[PDB]
């Protein structure tokens, strides 16, 4: 139900891998447990066995703007970009952005 303000990660981005994940928040201010992590969970083959990818999280010009940039190129398949936003009031907001790559 709860989701960040606006972002451009890869909302069900099926067709090809994007350049970088984008995130925006009118009240980011992490300093809690906010972040992001990309996991390559291609089609179900090994009893659903996800794996974290070698990526990094870096904010844009503003600190309220997040920009995920993987050090490695996203190959075809399926991936899930799990992000977590939290302002300041316990109960962190969790979200995931799945996308395909062809
Ligand atoms: Cu709130």
Swiss-Prot record:
Cu(2+) binds at residues 1, 91. This is Copper resistance protein C. It is found in: Periplasm. The chain holds residues 25 to 126 of 126 of the full protein. Induction: By copper. GO terms for molecular function: copper ion binding. Belongs to the CopC family. One of its GO terms (biological process) is response to copper ion. Cu(+) binds at residues 40, 43, 46, 48, 51. The redox state of copper bound to CopC may act as a switch between the possible trafficking pathways of the metal ion. Changing residue 27 to G: Increases affinity for copper(II). The gene is copC. Copper-binding protein involved in copper resistance and homeostasis. Probably mediates copper resistance by sequestering the excess of copper in the periplasm. May act as a copper carrier in the oxidizing periplasmic space that exchanges either Cu(I) or Cu(II) with its putative partners CopA, CopB and CopD. Disruption phenotype: Disruption of the gene reduces copper resistance to intermediate levels. Contains two copper binding sites, separated by 30 angstroms, which can be occupied either one at a time or simultaneously. One is specific for Cu(I), while the other is specific for Cu(II). Oxidation of Cu(I) or reduction of Cu(II) causes migration of copper from one site to the other. The availability of an unoccupied site of higher affinity induces intermolecular transfer of either Cu(I) or Cu(II). One of its GO terms (cellular component) is plasma membrane.
